[PDB]
Design a protein around this ligand. Structure first.
Ligand SMILES: CCCCCCCC/C=C\CCCCCCCC(=O)O[C@@H](COC(=O)CCCCCCCCCCCCCCC)COP(=O)([O-])OCC[N+](C)(C)C
Ligand SMILES: CCCCCCCC/C=C\CCCCCCCC(=O)O[C@@H](COC(=O)CCCCCCCCCCCCCCC)COP(=O)([O-])OCC[N+](C)(C)C
Ligand SMILES: CCCCCCCC/C=C\CCCCCCCC(=O)O[C@@H](COC(=O)CCCCCCCCCCCCCCC)COP(=O)([O-])OCC[N+](C)(C)C
Ligand SMILES: CC(C)CCC[C@@H](C)[C@H]1CC[C@H]2[C@@H]3CC=C4C[C@@H](O)CC[C@]4(C)[C@H]3CC[C@]12C
Ligand SMILES: O=S1(=O)NCN(C2CC2)c2ccc(F)cc21
Ligand SMILES: O=S1(=O)NCN(C2CC2)c2ccc(F)cc21
Ligand SMILES: O=S1(=O)NCN(C2CC2)c2ccc(F)cc21
Ligand SMILES: O=S1(=O)NCN(C2CC2)c2ccc(F)cc21
Ligand SMILES: *[C@@H]1O[C@H](CO)[C@@H](O)[C@H](O)[C@H]1NC(C)=O
Lengths: 446, 446, 446, 446
């Protein structure tokens, strides 16, 4: 029938926390958190009766050097007003001089919080990138230009008018093949490297086709080479994953809680990587050292802000917000711990207790309960450097647009020929219906 | 001041090891390492003197299960024949109930050692990789697609029905050279940049040949550019990435030291992933359970294998050798700690001391000394080996597959004709040997 | 201990500057910088106290040439109204004959500031760059070469003399389709990957068409690959690289502060390079001689210009701005030094002191503090802009040049034929207008 | 008529040095060096008479901490046995406590010495690199393989034997064009992307040509892509130019003089770059810290040795040996100086003198005299990333080899046809001479 114990906690999340319910009448039934699950299991295997009681200051603990005294939870331990400190109260060199701890039950770390890479969004015309929109207009102007020149040269040049029926010699007919329609077909035929028939014959037309070929060879070998340059630097581009990789940047900005434990590390740092990281912060001590963790989250979502905090509070917000991530490893290495008054007969019986809960694996079950929650749809890390339908893609759009464009021209040829010969003969339909049957007659004659 | 301290320590890799020098007589300088460098600052802040001994029955410590009867270092700390036991000694619930520990000075867990992804077996069909397998299906649906629309328009257009036989004008003959067979041949011919022997007249089927040419120019330039992106910046990856990925597969096989801290972890575990992993090792004992750490690396380094040791021992071996890396995060969490006999006041003194050295970062500065090294910086400079049969051997397979497909068609064409030669009032079997002599007639006439 | 020391100092960029904060009243904290950070370790080793004043007539110091009558800081050190004069004061023969100096704590010389090579005007004929201009000459000597050897073998081979007119066999007709004109056309046709309408039979001219095809496949694949190498990793360079390179040119124009240490250097020089450079500036005074340092950067940053100041002032400006760099090595060599009145024993004390701070590297640690910064790390990540008229505008020039060349040939072919129409017993002038009506006859017959 | 002065020097080069001549009888006419040119000009403008006298120890100066005394030149200054120290005696913190200096007359620096990049030597067949020598054998085996298959299929397939004289209908002849000679010409014609006539007609031969086209498209797009990978990483490869860039390496090894002033800098270094540089040296204190400068030069020429010394002695050996260079800037910053006894009336009159020689520019003339010598043919920094005749080059060898091979085949066709018809007719020569005339008859008939 010993005295019940009096623990002092602080309202952090997923740490101790009011039970979300109506009908208010509660003793120790107010609080519902990670540590209240921890205080329950430590009470079972040691056999004591706790009585939770919040801290009055609302602070962890610090030493006002002017007064030379303490505040917060750690003052309640010194004056023996409480005797347990089940809390996120970390382990520092200044605290252990005054009060006594147990062994750690969670491992902290400093790590970088930052927005996920949102995506690419190439737009499904990305094949059209490696030349300027001036060049794609000028090439199409050149192919209409050179075709209109080649039609004019093939009229005037007398060596072009050769003899048709080349297999039937000794007649009197001449015919050049470069009409207006075929002259575009030589230009388009040479532009897409496929060649054509009706090659130029006279030397005045050999020069035009001889120099248009050299125009196509430089364009297509430039489009192939430049598209290799886009796809090389995209795979060669890597997202940042370090503190040192984020140290070299200047466009992406740092951040911390004002006069917290994170700022304390960088002023006392001696690493050359971390030394310049304090130099960028102290240069900008108006816009990145914001106030606290709650304002540090909001600045990441609305900027290029790369806030730094402890590794636990990263792992709770990345599970509750799938926009965010945990770039980088662990900078520092700290730990939590149940605190006790100086020289008390409980720093051992909790040290025994925390290890026994570790052997049975309960601390990992208590962490996966509270820190995972409403399981994220996360994965979606496609990033596949292989041309899908997000990229090239739209070449099938202009392909299908061309084939539909052809069918309206095919109706145009079908109507124009059917109304041409019908002005010589039978009126409209008995000329048109017999052409559809002559089409539908599968025999290769008529 | 009083008499010196007998620091009982075991000898391992980079904590305590002999000097490699001359004059083999030294005494009290016979051991050096990280753990020895820890003691040099331990005697600086807290004043004491050394008599570093090595344990005569060198082990860490365990039960007897028949006499209780501890071994290793911690057997010496009970009988007070020793002192502070600064070593790679791990905090465990069984050990803490007997002697004492300080608060930990190094964190560690269980993680996975595995061969680094090499990239010298990419698969024999590696050339498909620059395009997504949707697009390889889509260009066949395009090439079979456009050829069918080419066949419809070529019969629908009246200007395609042209006059053959230019040696003989003024006839009734008419050809429509695009069959169903030739229409696929124009599409396949333009797809492979080789042209064809026929070509569209009659403008409504010029657009189809026009827009299909521009389709093939973008695809082949996209295939050439993206294949140039692969051979410039290679990006290899591991098959398995976490313990959950390694739990599912059975191609790679697992590994753990028998009767060690790792094997006893999975026997006591109750996670559904790890209980599957212990169900593996219990079945295949004496084949995957190594008997020592050094034999365990050789199982990775020779065979296809995965190994599970403590994370600090991984972080040294992966700096020495470049063949192998660490896969995944830390599974468990335990700590190394300074041993101390039960009730000695040096426990609380070193606990203050280790937190002091943490604040300047002397622990981190010493860990950089005794785990860094060569660094394996050869993940650069991209040697760019020549293409060979390891990479593009797949096209020699699909070349021979086409020719074997061709002979089955060539027999099918030979047997189809003799059926219609049997339609001309002959024997089907006799007319086969008649035509086979005509192939072997070998003259180029009739 | 005695009274304090009146440290007379001028105010400049990053040596001594005001604080940017609130509470404008401070006193003895009103100045901070590199040179102020030097004094903090100067009072640490050698004990003294501060009364930092600023010089009322702020200059460094020079003659009067009419009254002698020094100015600046060193006028105060003569009359003993001052003390140690730690500042950007330079050791010079005229100054050392009057007061004293310590041994120098910073080395510096005269070097050249200039615009960074940008790379946004590569030249309009930039596509010639992947091949050497020997090879562009060599493929024309090959294409004119192989076509001539094609013409010889085609007449030398009896199997090329084949039978034309396949509609009519059993004749005496024979063609040799390779003329001199067609032989160049086959070479140009195979060079531009377009094929031709004629093709060799007769095996001895198949090898020529065989080996020329393999010649063109290697060249065009080499042009495409090397052009892809340029657009991936750009490598810009400066026009001038040293003072000797800048001495020869007259396109870029020089620059120096009037009546400064730089302008007085070149007037006294006797090196043949620099005497040419002073012959430039004496001719073009009031156009290239700036009147202040800050106006001198603006001449570089706006116009095409080169500037010559001290090397330390360059090394700060090039860290702040990214538009401009340093070109070449140091020309002169001078030093900064702590001033001291004539005969004061503080000269030899600081001389010991500066050598002390050099040994730990406190000078180098402070110089990293007050000259580094943003660093301009943007010489990475290779934005890979699209090809445009700045880069491949040259082929539109050589396209239009070919067509204007074509019309002069087309007139030459039209006038050549009417000469032989005048050979058929007609007027040369009258038969021209007869044939010009036949082009304008516009019917496709006779 | 004051006393003549007694200077003590040491036999360094280009410092004081015996005059290379016979007929030995010399006073102060022995020595002939940089400093003897310096001692001459200081004697003129101050008006004293020197008397040179070498040091007896042969050492610069050092403090044996066991004895607590000095040696070398600096002991001769303390005991007043000499009174000048015109030498390469540097300025250190330990020397200036005991003796007094003048201002520096030369600026040292620590810099890295290393072998020049010897070259590339691609071998002029470098186009043949991006495929393995197995692939270039297998492609040539495939083109002989597929051609021999296509000849066999075109014999058996009855749809291949179409009608010749296609312009002359209604005859009875059949003729397939796929002979043995044309079947190779289809394979070679499709291999180099140029196409051909005599396209396959029956579906059994459409499959062979349909799948050989896909074989060529993968090969040529692989050869283009892989050659881009070679030429990208060659431009992306950069030679080392830093100390930090050489810090990351492990294949290229460091080096220093045993217990010299260079080793003194790295043990007292605090830069994280330089700290690991001492870690690599102290790990290998048997093979890189060789003995001295004379053995340090020989190790660079015969290894991958990257020796470190002062900046002056680099600049003398790189002018006398064009194999070597001065990679990197200046690590440290030191200086030389005329030394004097402690508190002597000459540390000022030399300080005045050295500046007056600096204003007239004589120290730069005295440096360009002795440190340049037998002016190097240096420049040869072509390194032009543009395909010259060192690269591709050899495609002109196989081009010229093919054209010479053709002419021996052309004689073979000319002899075989001339001896074929002559067995029907006229004996040998009057058939052969009339074919040469029929060749030489320029008319296109016969
Ligand atoms: C860069 C390189 C590009 C260029 C490529 C260069 C590469 C060069 C590589 C090689 C070049 C070799 C040239 C070929 C020489 C032959 C000559 C010829 O063709 O004409 C001849 C046709 O003879 C024939 O070849 C066709 C025969 C028709 C039917 C035969 C059926 C075979 C049976 C199926 C077998 C199935 C059994 C096996 C299956 C398991 C006729 O003309 P002739 O010669 O005047 O007449 C000779 C008459 N005599 C023969 C009686 C004397
Ligand atoms: C794969 C295709 C193979 C075929 C090859 C055929 C092309 C080979 C022919 C010629 C190339 C050889 C000349 C290049 C020499 C250096 C360039 C130069 O100095 O440019 C200068 C002159 O500006 C120009 O006028 C450009 C150079 C001539 C190109 C104009 C003719 C194009 C060919 C028309 C017919 C084509 C069709 C012909 C066949 C039907 C200025 O430019 P830049 O910015 O100062 O350049 C820097 C170079 N530099 C550092 C040395 C100064
Ligand atoms: C992806 C896309 C690829 C495909 C490309 C698609 C792109 C499409 C773009 C364009 C397509 C447009 C088609 C053209 C329509 C014409 C029809 C035709 O050709 O036949 C006609 C030939 O008429 C001629 O055009 C040739 C006449 C020859 C002599 C004329 C010389 C001109 C004088 C020099 C001038 C110098 C002065 C200026 C100098 C500064 C005849 O056939 P018909 O029509 O039955 O008869 C009509 C008779 N009527 C006219 C009396 C009614
Ligand atoms: C579909 C709408 C826009 C109408 C298009 C009309 C086009 C397709 C028609 C109208 C007149 C036609 C031309 C009339 C006569 C000839 C001469 C013949 O020897 C070849 C075809 C050719 C050259 C035709 C080509 C197609 C043509 C240009
Ligand atoms: O409170 S501690 O025992 N002392 C400091 N350490 C170390 C990083 C070594 C750590 C690291 C992680 C912890 F959880 C606790 C501690
Ligand atoms: O042996 S401990 O003091 N107690 C158990 N824990 C925890 C896993 C929470 C840890 C975690 C890391 C350590 F370094 C030590 C310990
Ligand atoms: O003011 S000095 O002591 N005298 C002149 N010298 C020398 C050029 C040798 C130098 C060179 C660099 C300095 F920093 C100082 C001096
Ligand atoms: O003998 S010193 O005046 N003291 C040290 N300094 C340096 C600040 C680097 C230098 C640098 C170059 C010198 F030539 C002399 C000196
Ligand atoms: C340069 O030539 C020397 C002399 O044999 C040779 O040892 C060295 O390897 C060459 N350099 C390179 C980079 O191959």
């Amino acid at each position: 029938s010993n005295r019940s114990l009096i623990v002092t906690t602080i309202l952090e999340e997923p740490y101790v926390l009011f039970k979300k319910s109506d009908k208010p009448l509660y003793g120790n039934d107010r609080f519902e958190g990670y540590c209240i699950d921890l205080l329950r299991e430590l009470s079972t295997i040691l056999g004591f009766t706790y009585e939770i009681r919040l801290v009055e200051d609302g602070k962890y603990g610090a030493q006002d050097d002017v007064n030379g005294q303490w505040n917060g939870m750690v003052r309640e331990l010194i004056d023996h007003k409480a005797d347990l400190a089940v809390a996120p109260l970390a382990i520092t060199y200044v605290r252990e001089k005054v009060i006594d701890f147990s062994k750690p039950f969670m491992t902290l770390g400093i790590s970088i919080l930052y927005r996920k890479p949102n995506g690419t969004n190439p737009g499904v015309f990305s094949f059209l990138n490696p030349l300027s929109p001036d060049i794609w207009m000028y090439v199409l102007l050149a192919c209409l230009g050179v075709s209109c020149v080649l039609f004019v040269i093939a009229r005037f040049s007398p060596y072009e008018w050769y003899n048709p029926h080349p297999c039937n010699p000794d007649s009197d007919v001449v015919e050049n093949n470069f009409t207006l329609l075929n002259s575009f077909w030589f230009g388009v035929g040479a532009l897409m490297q496929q060649g054509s028939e009706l090659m130029p014959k006279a030397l005045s037309t050999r020069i035009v086709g001889g120099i248009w070929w050299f125009f196509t060879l430089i364009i297509i070998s430039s489009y192939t080479a430049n598209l290799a340059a886009f796809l090389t630097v995209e795979r060669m581009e890597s997202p940042i994953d370090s503190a040192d990789d984020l140290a070299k940047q200047t466009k992406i900005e740092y951040g911390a809680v004002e006069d917290g434990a994170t700022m304390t590390f960088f002023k006392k740092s001696k690493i050359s990587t971390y030394d310049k990281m304090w130099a960028f912060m102290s240069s900008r001590r108006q816009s990145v050292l914001v106030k606290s963790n709650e304002e540090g989250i909001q600045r990441v979502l609305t900027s290029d802000y790369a806030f730094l905090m402890e590794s636990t509070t990263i792992e709770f917000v990345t599970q509750r917000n799938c926009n965010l991530t945990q770039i980088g490893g662990l900078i520092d290495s700290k730990g939590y711990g149940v605190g006790t008054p100086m020289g008390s007969p409980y720093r051992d019986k909790i040290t025994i207790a925390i290890l026994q809960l570790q052997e049975e694996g309960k601390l990992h079950m208590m962490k996966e309960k509270w820190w995972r929650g409403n399981g994220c749809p996360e994965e979606e890390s496609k990033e596949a450097s292989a041309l899908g339908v997000q990229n090239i893609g739209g070449i099938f759009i202009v392909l299908a647009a061309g084939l539909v464009l052809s069918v309206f021209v095919a109706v145009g040829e079908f109507l124009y020929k059917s109304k041409k010969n019908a002005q010589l003969e039978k009126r409209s339909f008995c000329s048109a219906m017999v052409e559809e049957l002559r089409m539908s007659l599968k025999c290769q004659r008529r």
